[model samples]
Target: MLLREINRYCKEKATGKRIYAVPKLWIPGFFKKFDEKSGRCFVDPYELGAEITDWILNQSREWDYSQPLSFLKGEKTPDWIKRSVVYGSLPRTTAAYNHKGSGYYEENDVLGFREAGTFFKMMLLLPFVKSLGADAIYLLPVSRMSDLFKKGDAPSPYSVKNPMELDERYHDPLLEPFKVDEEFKAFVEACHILGIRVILDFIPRTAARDSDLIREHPDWFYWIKVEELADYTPPRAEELPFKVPDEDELEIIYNKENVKRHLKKFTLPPNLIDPQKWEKIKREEGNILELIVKEFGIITPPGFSDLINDPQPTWDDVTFLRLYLDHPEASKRFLDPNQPPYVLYDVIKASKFPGKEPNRELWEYLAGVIPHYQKKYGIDGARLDMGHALPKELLDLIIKNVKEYDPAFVMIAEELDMEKDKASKEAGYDVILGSSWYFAGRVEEIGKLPDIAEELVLPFLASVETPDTPRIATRKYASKMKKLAPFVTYFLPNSIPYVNTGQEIGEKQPMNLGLDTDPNLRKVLSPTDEFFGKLAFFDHYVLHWDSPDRGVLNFIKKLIKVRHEFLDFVLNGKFENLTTKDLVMYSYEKNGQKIVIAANVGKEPKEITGGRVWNGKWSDEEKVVLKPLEFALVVQ
Candidate 1:
């Protein structure tokens, strides 16, 4: 029966455990399991009751890999980074991965990002996270992104674009979007009220080549050098005024099929529908579409596309935009038809040759803006997106300013170099991401975990899955190893336990948890990801937040609960590898309070063959035999 779902939700409501709440849509009709073929859920065939809920849910296991390794992978994290750092994860404004049965909309007239009202959803999700592991929430970028450059259902909340603005889509029309800064802050405060620390993701390394800063400050860009700025001056009334495209004007370049390829968007009402007004040179009427284009006096002759390398190679989205050269202030100094019209520059290039300095105007925003979130929003910290992509000096300077503004701040980096590199130590980041530790690529390895962890000079984040890779659940070889990774990833001594949202559910399908609800439909992969739609991660995924055998939630919860319970021992514990004779059945120990995590990394079951196994509670295990892919947390 789903008896617990109703009883527990009410119990939480009565106790005010959540403090604030979102709609009950994601609340599952909790029962014992999902053997029922016709419903929705996140499951674990693992045993149930005190054994599963009390012990496991209470504590064992790591979780969904964090972000996929996009660039370099550093091998170390310094000792100091862990202090004051709290972390978890965040998402949505999107639904499922592929356009498949993605998007579970309850209120919007148009299907897009999460409607503004559920802004309360983040707060409500806190209670569920207690067991899922992770205390701080490193939310995906939330700053406003370009409405034009957006390629999927909405623009990516990528690094810094408009530091203080909320995307129009994120605001409830009932409230004034032009003024949402305070409300945004309110949402962060709401998270704080729930004991959930918010780490805003900030990407300052790059801004759009065609962006808010371009008109008044072309010098803000790297490729358009300040010395080459004469012709790029902002347009004046005498010169043709620049134009922004409307629905119809933007559709001219789409493929001519039933679903004419074009930029799709949700905007304030009174915009054009489908412009069927003018066909030829003759004058036309009733078509708001005509005025939209005609009024857009200087729109760049636009084009749309997905990269040739992308798997879908279909009209999945608009990944390309050709800048309009005709605009008075436009230049193609670095335009390449084969590439997207926007210019590209690494920090070295953007900052200038020999990497002395980058555009001052750009650095100005990078240096000061994020702290606004820390101070005004009560944000605990930030996940600095690709910090290495920025000049190291600026990176340190930015971290310094934010910490000075709020000394308790924890800065996590999207840096792939997970080591205690000089730049990282000087920058003083609390945590940075680590290697592509996902090992199912080869046969599973107990050694792989230690290999990834040992060199991390800075305190490192270790995991078998992350945002941009195939889920560990999807691994076909040594299949049961999927069950093993959750426990392994989270229990590493000295490593902070991080669990991605859906990781708790154990659902392998990439999900748009925030947007879609149907278990059947949640299977769709994102059309926008560069990989085959089947492979979903990063900007294109969301959690399938409903449940039952929600037993995995228990499985993951135990890992986190126990890990945190033994924080002192594990956080500062010493490691010793024992039981070396059996290669597949490996055993290791964390010396404090005596904890040992023994695993069978291979396909079939195996026996411990020696010392008695601890069954948490400092007691011994009843069974000496290990299951095919099982974790027996033996405690002293």
Candidate 2:
């Protein structure tokens, strides 16, 4: 049944009136094996489509792999999660192809198929993800994104317009008549067929400046006058620390003149200001944000870093949701009772200063998001964006609502601090997107890997880079280091190996500067390059799957072989760090078998205390020499 249905879609494309030029670069290794004699630059869908269908059918016994999460039904997370390798895929760019040969990414090709990656294209890449031994794909947001204040050719997926609605742009015109949701469902089904799980990234703390919810509950957002929009900025509180201020500090913050001025900019919601006009605007189905901007001269203020005194500019496309109806209790001592509720460092960080009157209605809606996907698509897990900033009650509710349906559904926290592992686990999260992305590049700090394994109660991502960080391939000694890093990341104790979608082929550009990144890295692309200054997070861009550094593809495949041979040990063994100066070495041992992972962090070669195992040969020497940035695996 699976092969039959998949082939039908392939036949549609193969026999379509217009032949969409499928890039040879997009074809997986398995499909390419069948057509090796034809060294054509482009793939013939008619021939390869029929060939791949037969290949997939032979691999399946009963022809059903649709129930990806059916085996998970306990309070404990499945063992696969701990041992899994993750592929971080930002769909808009990951599976995108320049079918038009336009030299740059276009919104659509001549055939009207989305030039940006779609669910259909992503489904086709499942075999490629499987080739790298990745059992889970962590998809970046696919929800409707707002472009009212878009940054690049496209808007940031983080600026979600509706949490429940899949973006129509993710639909392929080739798959006409089928809705976006069905295309997404087909993608999920393909992932399951390959023994791969799907995890979605969700942003609940903030939404688009013109969110769909604004039409229903205008008060659910923070708003300011039209005149204020020009000068609107996060209020300055010099006395407060760099991080989110505590309740005591809120008193000083409220007293600041800038804070007072910022507060005055806010006004009552447009609906409350003129109910009759709001009623009329609601009656007519149109752009709600524009209608309100025209009538009331008021707009929702753009959001900024929750941290105080951060240098980043305000997020122009998104706004913070008002999680509470009333002002924080700490502010009551300083502000007049008649003052309108406004957004500030205290309110955006609702986890720290939750008011007595919580937005119960909004809380229910937010908590229902994961369960909605679970029921509709059978997604296996999620990583809540900025979940650390949500109120404890709301976070707990979100977890409970989903667990009630699928107990083993994985919940990953956005916590990057390893110190907060226990807290995140207590908050009902199974794992975290840990600080490995930060430490992996810092040779001096890389020694903390073993310590993290010893300290954390939950597994963390052994990710050298993520969509939010600069690519590892762009760093110093990347040619040698890039090859070595994957081995170490795969063998890291208490870590789930995470390969950013572009990392396998050595794409250097980052998807976003959300973490441990410098804004200057955006200039890494050449001025003449088509993707110059284009971030995958908010731009129409395609992955360099045809990169010269494609050698890393085979390196990862070989590394996974070693990982699987010792998978039982890596998952269940006791972690021990054995280190000398500039040499990082650790071992995981169980049942009298041991696997030693060693890396040289210094600029020069170093000798570490370990038996050298080169290929199948075991050296008699007590110590092994490692080249700079070199990684090795020793089994005893």
Candidate 3:
């Protein structure tokens, strides 16, 4: 059935032309058909689909992916989890290709075929990922998202509409009889067969402004009059620092005339404003958000930066979930008894100032989200988005709930502060998404890496670039940086090496410009370029898999080999910052094994003594020399 559906699509949309273009190596021996002139391999649906089906069936017969691995038995926190290299990808963007030979990307090909990355296509890409030595694939959110107030061509995955449901967009049209959940299960089975784990990203702290939860639990969101939304901005307190204010600060803030003005715009939630009309709309059960907007005079206000003076504009797509029913205790002194729920820095940062009346129903619902996926899709772990902002009680309950289901479930905290690694670990996280992405790409801040490594109680992601930052390919020392970063990060003790999608192929475009980057980074591509000023996070984009600088893949594979050889020292070694006179150098020593990794971040050659060569030129038996912006790995 699947093969027939795909063949029909190919015949209708791309008769005599290839409906799918994949690398020759991705599906070897399946089809001998290739374009000798253009040197492109176009997939023959009947032939390729049969190969996929057979491979899946053979793997399923060999092993049950739904069952836990034998090696993972009795291990609560395995060393393999810490040493594993993770490849991060936004499924819709990373696996996307111009299969139809179109210059621009489209959600559907000209033939109305799904061209964006789907779960089935992602499973096919797993072999390529494993070839790069990634023991795990970390996917960004796969949950259904909202298109209301969407920023670009598509909605950001972070603006989750319903956390419990898989996004229908990820469903492949070629799989006629298979549901998305089944395809996802098969994808997970493929990963486990290849000895790779899967980690999913989840945003439990916030939801789409027009969330599916609004109909039943309207009070779980903050709302303001539709007319006031145009003028609504987070109230500013000039004396406050860029953090959740304390008790005294909150008292002063609520009394300010500007704060009072901001508060007055808020109105009751739609359901509370007119219960009879809300009940009628609920009974109809069609486009609840649209109905509420059309019938009520209020809207779920957009969320802003939790910090007092952060310059980032209000996040127009998502809103913070109200963790508490009543106003925060600190702000109650100045607020009127009749005040409706309003969004402000204090309310958004609920962890710091929680209300006496906890939203138990909402909390219970959210705590079940990860477990739902675990039972259904069998994901190995999750990275909680903005988890630090969630209250201690809620965060604890979430972790407890998941751990009870699978004790070995890996917990990743989206905490960037290295100093708070202990706190994050105590809160039931196995690792933290550290600030390495912020400092590693820039040469001047390279020295701070050692400081972070020294203080971390949990392994941090050693990433030079992430889904939210500028690509290293567009940064200074592009060629050299890409070459040096892998070795440096791989050898960093107590770190998990990360490869964001498009990093290996030297993509110049950034997925987003949300952190430690300039808005001007959006102009890195030429104005005439197809993807110029577009973000992969919110726009239809594909990795430049056809780029000339595809040699980065070979470099990554080579580095992974070296890392495997020194796996023990890299994961659980004594780290020391070495002196190399202007070169950033470090060493990891464990048991009897030792390796020195150094990088000349400057624009000149640097010589270092007592380091026998493993990857750099040797001046003598006792010395190694590195070229401008070059890095070296050596055995001591």
Candidate 4:
């Protein structure tokens, strides 16, 4: 299956200025393999060969002078990609927690920290985060949550009803409208002063079930109604009165001619109640139902009418205002249909009810809105909400239009099932939510690190909510993170910190909606807790730039520093997996400098047998051994 088999010629002849035949040979129908048993056409030998040659040539293009494939050799070392980390989910405002005897209290009651405004908290938190040596702070959604249609008194922040407005509850009183709060303003100023960047969350699918927009545009909503005949009801249910009155045979009104006449009269007048009009209405409704079932691929109950309505139109109907009535034409002035569409349907269905539009129309609207936000505010990115919910074609369109606005605008994706190659790095997102670091494998085992490390090869934010396993597993997890630090630093925007109030204090909470007033977890970051100082230290040093060598903290700091210092390595380093049974070791290299990272996951200390040149010294030193759950970071 080597690439050279498909292209008629080898690398030297095809792209070496000798000939371009190999690349030219690639045609749509070219086939290399036909299986007799399966009746399948597989990769064409020439095509596969050509692809390999092309890849080899591309790799050579990255180097100084063009060299033949024969001279290429793999190098083992750490590169820029191994040096970055992200810090995420710091509370925007102090969360409330119950006290020992009295009622609920803020951070002050447990940790002596005041319940300050979002801006003030940022001011205080950024310095701490920056002290850990991270390059960026990935903030959670700061936008206002809709007060309307919340299931309970408090709503989950992720279930946002509005994407445009900031949450007023987080605003400090001292801050002016449209002005950054003093605390947050000061924090941002400090971050820039300290060289740390900030990232904000943007969720597009979340809206109030009954949003103001929905009220004003009822046509935008998806609606369904259930109907049951009186005879269809159970005998016991039939004993109860039917909800709607039954019509008599005399009142049935079944004349086809009359129905047509009634429909014409109804169409001529602004409003009509003729029998023909009613029949026409029924037909139109049937047409909508048929369209949804056939075209949109929707399934419904036997007695139910499911319609995919436009939420915007529903809002318009309810609010009596027209926002995007003139959009498709108006959008053409700035958008290109050939380009991918930007707006994504949260969930697409076949029937027309509300919030349903041609895919093209939806994208046009998104293309228009994306630039509006960037132009009006300094917002530089968007975090797609439920990214997996949209079709891939639509997602691609959204990414294309966003880049059209600002290429550097970060796109963060929240997808339930994300593949690194297809969704995050190459697909368009600058970063993605990582669930690997904390669960399933136990945060401690380097050997169990998902293959995503080899695939996406980017920054992965590890969180506290990640599953806690055996102590050995924990050690391995920490060590693996340290070893992979250099590579992750270069590829990812930053690591995340999803610690709730008591996570730092080793308090374990049952996974719940987080809205409950009373939690079973212990107080977080309690001064008296044994793990408090260690947790705080890890948080501060790993995220800040100043403290370089606070035990394991220094390892992470150095990796991040190296990543920022070497962009090429982080941006384009090759991942090579090393042979090992108990440890997971890997190397990434760009330019001259080499980094060797290894993790010891066993219960006892083990010596590393392989040795690479370090500072011009080549020695197979068994003395470079690591203790159980320990890792090493060597630079030469």
Candidate 5:
């Protein structure tokens, strides 16, 4: 009764609401047990003692029990939650990203990190890493890409062709770096020694359509053919729309006539495709999908979205696997089911592939390749790609398998769930990604932040930009939204800050496609003109680190230093949002000694009165006039 009363009191005072202070959580022992069959540690399995279990459940939320008697104890945070992450790609960092937009393939244009490039570039970045205070770096996937035909010399790196082989095209070896698995191993060794933990991107879904894995283990992938398999086109997958609720079988609406129209509407550019091989490759894929369905049940779409290949954005091509199940209840979608799902006879023949297995092998391959980096290079963990989109079984397996070698290995996801109490933290990961996900709403969205202050239960890998997002300052320059970018990115409560390489110096152009075209309308910089990108591919438009906006870059550095100096509360304490209807004036604090971050994200210079900066400049006389797009961290 006393516990409940005090809990209610704190909630009322803290955020003007009467709510519970603590959560219903296990205290880490007997109550939590592993269930072999279920694959998840049992949530509350004191089932044998139901009446006893009921007591723990009843008090779990409002009361703290069993020997640890203290008031309002802090949440138990994980160690991996303490560090920041920087999403990096080698082409952008090494000189490899440079290229021309409308041009022929000139292989030597990119000065990549192949031969000593890895050690050299990251070592150059070491000072920047320390100065910016980021402790971990998550490199985009470094797997070898497929030999598929595409518009540019480099297609999407996600076009993973060899899960087991290194893309030697990206490596140079010099006096010698590592090779195969050792390529990453040596890089990981270099990072660990430099004091920055490393993580790699992991995608377990479709590999390059012509990947070596698909060649050796066709059973491992999800191959699809809505058209006649052998007659299908080359280098493109049967793309699908996101799920539509009314569809019973997640089918693609195709008229046999529409197919001919689709192909005839556009002439296949000669340089873009190989006609002779297309026929052979198309037949090869047709035979494989046919064989898989005839032998093993096809991997039916969990939904239309289960297999997607957006010809737009990032990876322009995608594919899906088919299934063959004999189930009584299986809908007519996968051919009238009312039976159980089963595998093929030959699928389990001389090979180790499981009759009971469908897609786990695809996922297993990704984990196998990445952890080899960890196992061999001493790299720390993985930053899961499309984590929110993968199936729950696969998510569990991905998290469970990757961390098997080192439990302490960090696993961060590209998810941004912002409940007052973040549910993503409990979803088997250390950090949920942040920044542009929440802040594009700007000062107008300020009022929605109180829940985050009270319930952002884990540290966020706060970022304003990434390889996927536009250049931080450059994107915002049009709306003065760039003004608020700095304050929001680094100072958010519980921020483990992440900044892309050029985000530090205010690089204003988002990456572009290098086939002699610039989407955002900028042209090439001469190789001798201090370098900039004509297009943005992993293989083009490298950063211009030597360029301007020195003042903004230096101020950003100061913010990083300040973030570390106050790591005590920023990383560990609770958040308390203090902002207003004015919108432009949003503020928050950690552990409440009056360290308020107040900003005016509008165009007109606004003066804040009665603020708390504690005798400092922004605090002096309780007043400060912020210039357009200026923000201040008022020291408590």
Candidate 6:
């Protein structure tokens, strides 16, 4: 009989559908007696009988011995738990809706309005989200931190003052003050009715100096003396430690002037100086640039000597300097030889640093506030911010408390590396961010029918962000990465941030601009951007059973069908790599059904080979070619 037949026969005969088991040992030398019984030749019948008896005995031990053997041995199939996908939503200005007649407010503007009416409107976004086939919605930080720290005229939303209070600025005075927002409650109910789950952001650092937590629980923050500067060092550039070449040892390949001319393209423009004042300018500018570089690990290239004199004092200066030095073309905006040094310094100082860790105190304060929102707003989970920065103990405490309050709670970590994945999971995160899969080249190789191993795919998420960008942009590259998307969404065991607004409009941006106001980064999608949306049909079918895609309308319909059909395979089957050159394809099988995923990552189209199955049925020898950036989902 073929392997497929054998598998089917074994499954049928196993009765309880239990595939994994251990057999008992037979007595040594029992194989001496051989016999033919019931028309079946039994070699070493004595040993065979002994082995059968041992197997039964071992099976008996798996259940309560006291129960009747017949009842205990009843047939039962092991049911695996269905995994879920998560889509994150950013409602930045939810509070603004609470105030009456706030003109020019966008959908997210309601964040500041802490009134029931405003919250209800924010909740309405769920149904629209459901239309996109998402099962989970991760809302960015919604805690009331407004007005706690007066920032001259306006406070930065990220800088929280009081995490516990609902931002009164967003509250409508007509409603009973201090009451749980009715609109928010209604929204949660709506989500439950639609079978969608909710998650919130937990930023446990960077709080205001005068925050309530600071006043009441000062120990939570990492406080420094007024005269002392907080440690704000950048991650040191990775260096190759090797002996410097001696002058004599180095080859005299070219003259200094010849070498300079050759290196001109790579070097920044030379600094021009007044012959007399040159010495004074060089001394002052050189000193400041040296101090900034040494203290903050920023490198100032040679050409910008004049602008470096009054180098910015703020941490952002360090960030800008690093960017400018690394990308000369980008320096034109911040550093101009014509401008005064102080002017350049001020611009750099005012700019925001992209990846800096927020003050630890603010992180903890926000951590405490999330639970309250979870309970009051019926939020199901959270996508932690820079979770790697938080200590394991703190993360553990947060996860434990949240789980204690609600066992169904999920926590997704935005850890940047594999080391962070280990720590984040150990700290009790429910989902590992997609960074691991991204690093594994799953996106790049998804559509390509590559002959890579499964272990190779595991490292993909480690470099989740684009090499040029700071964070992952799912919509920007989803069409080219469909095969890997399922693996990333289902197998990675974490909340995937499927940005809703961006996905709907196909918004693609290099940076995370809050609600992305810049017109360049916020281009509305044209018809071409809808290609992925059409392809989302396959995703809708595969990610059934509480998939994040269920939140989207069409995605929900397709996913529900997939969930009903392939629950066992998706949940319990092991992954096996298939043969392909430019595409990476894999098969998942359970209960006699097989699901194959083929991703093509190469620029040119390629075909896959190898079809001899153990079951005697051979796939057609003809190569199955995939177009560039296309994926295939085959079920047999």
Best by TM-score: 2
Model 3, position 612, has a per-residue lDDT of 58
- Candidate 2's displacement at residue 203, Å, is 1.5
* lDDT for each residue of candidate 3 in 1-636, tens digit (9 for 90 to 100): 232333344344433444577655455444454453254467654455555545544544344565334224455553457868999989999777666764666788775567788987887676578778888899999999999888888899899999999899999887766788777877776777667888898988798988888878888888887898788888887777877677777778888899999999988877777889888886676677777777886788888888887767889999888888898877788888899887888888788888899999999999999999888766788899888678999999999987887777888998878888889988889888887866677777776677567677888888878998888777777777777766676667787889888887778888887877788888887888777888888888867665535567778777777778777776668878884446888888878777788888876888776555755234336776777677777877
Error of model 2, residue 466, in angstroms? 0.7
In candidate 2, stretches whose alpha carbon ends up further than 4 angstroms from where it belongs are 1-6, 16-19, 29-40, 44-68, 72-76, 608-623
True-structure RMSD, every candidate: 14.0, 2.8, 3.3, 23.3, 19.0, 22.9
Compared with the true structure, model 6 gives a TM-score of: 0.49
Per-residue lDDT over 79-147 for candidate 6, one digit per residue giving the tens place of the 0 to 100 score: 101243445543432112212222332322343323222343344344345544566565655555434
Clashes of each: 43, 0, 0, 98, 37, 75
The CA lDDT at 98 in model 2 is 71
| Cα TM-score per model | 0.61, 0.93, 0.93, 0.51, 0.65, 0.49
Model 2 misses residue 229 by how many Å? 0.2
Candidate 1 C-alpha error for residue 322, in Å: 20
lDDT-best of 4 and 6: 6
> Residue 394 lDDT in model 5?
56
lDDT scores in order: 0.42, 0.78, 0.77, 0.37, 0.45, 0.37
| Residues 263-334, model 5: lDDT tens digits | 232221111234453334434544433333343333221112322242333333333322211111212333
Model 2 steric clash pairs: none
Quote the positional error of residue 8 for candidate 4 in Å: 72
